[PDB]
């Protein structure tokens, strides 16, 4: 038949308008992310209709809303529509029409696209640190500093306080996390960052001995040395 609907004027809790169409909502409560793929955001869009769609076995029953299951890749702004469901109540609830085949399709959300700003917002909230990374870079030298001090008290010199000698652990030459490498030579521990910290490096140098006192200097290098914590760099 032909039924005219009056879509709800007030926004239901958990739904939000982010596009020109006031009857098209993002269902905030539906949003989920798998932490193993942290830039891939799963969500439903919901449209409240202004005319019923007769898509049920019973010829008098009609849909009042549509729920579209979407996947947004925040790394490349690709948006995939996965499934479309028709519901007999507003807000994508109630009895669901029989499933139809979705021509699964993906598109790139460039700045002219209707959903571009909605995607920016979804990504800001769900699609994904630096201080914790820098802390790990600092912690990398800790075991080596301890090893070098032990060496200096035992041997009475900084010469030969080198990785793989005098109880000093071997140099780390395999990148792991934010640490590219840790090397120790003659009382100098050189730490280089990796990835986001690739432009950060520091050198901890031991000088002296028991009688003079064992002193440490910290020298920082790299274009991003400004990211080191207050008072760290000498």
Give 108-157 as a DSSP string. E--TTSTTHHHHHHHHHHH---HHHHHHHHHHTTHHHHHHHHHHHHHHSS
- Paired strand residues for 215: 207
- Paired strand residues for 70: 43, 81
CATH fold label, 1-132? Lipocalin (2.40.128)
Residue 206 near residue 158, CB atoms below 8 Å: yes
Helix (H) or strand (E) holding 113: none
Residue 74 near residue 39, CB atoms below 8 Å: yes
Would you tell me how many other CB atoms lie within 10 Å of the CB of residue 30? 17
Residue 70 backbone phi and psi in degrees, to 5:
-120, 155
3-state percent helix, strand, coil for the chain, nearest multiple of 5: 20, 40, 40
Resolution in A: 1.6
Residue 212 near residue 190, CB atoms below 8 Å: no
CA 132/CA 137 separation, integer angstroms: 9
CA 142/CA 208 separation, integer angstroms: 19
Domains of the chain, by residue range, sit at 1-132, 133-234
Length of the chain: 234
Q: Give helix then strand counts, H and E, for the chain.
A: 3, 11
Residue 210 near residue 156, CB atoms below 8 Å: yes
Residue 143 backbone phi and psi in degrees, to 5:
-65, -35
């Amino acid at each position: 038949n032909d039924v005219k609907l009056a879509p709800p004027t007030d926004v239901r809790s958990g739904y939000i308008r982010l596009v020109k169409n006031v009857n098209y909502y993002i269902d905030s409560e539906s949003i989920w992310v798998d932490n193993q793929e942290p830039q891939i955001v799963h969500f439903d869009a919901v449209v409240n209709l202004d005319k019923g769609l007769y898509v049920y076995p019973e010829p008098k029953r009609y849909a009042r809303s549509v729920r579209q299951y979407k996947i947004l890749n925040c790394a490349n702004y690709h948006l995939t529509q996965v499934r479309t469901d028709f519901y007999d109540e507003f807000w994508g609830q109630g009895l669901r029409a029989a499933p139809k085949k979705q021509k699964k399709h993906t598109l790139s959300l460039t700045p002219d696209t209707t959903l571009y700003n909605a995607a920016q917002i979804i990504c800001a909230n769900y699609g994904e640190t630096k201080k914790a990374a820098v802390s790990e870079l600092l912690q990398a030298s800790a075991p080596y500093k301890a090893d070098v001090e032990l060496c200096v008290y035992s041997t009475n010199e900084t010469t030969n306080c080198t990785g793989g000698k005098n109880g000093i652990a071997a140099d780390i030459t395999t990148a792991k996390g934010y640490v590219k490498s840790v090397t120790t030579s003659n009382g100098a521990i050189t730490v280089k960052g990796d990835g986001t910290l690739a432009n950060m490096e520091y050198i901890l140098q031991a000088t002296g001995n028991a009688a003079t006192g064992v002193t440490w200097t910290t020298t920082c290098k790299g274009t991003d040395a400004s990211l080191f914590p207050a008072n760290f760099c000498g």
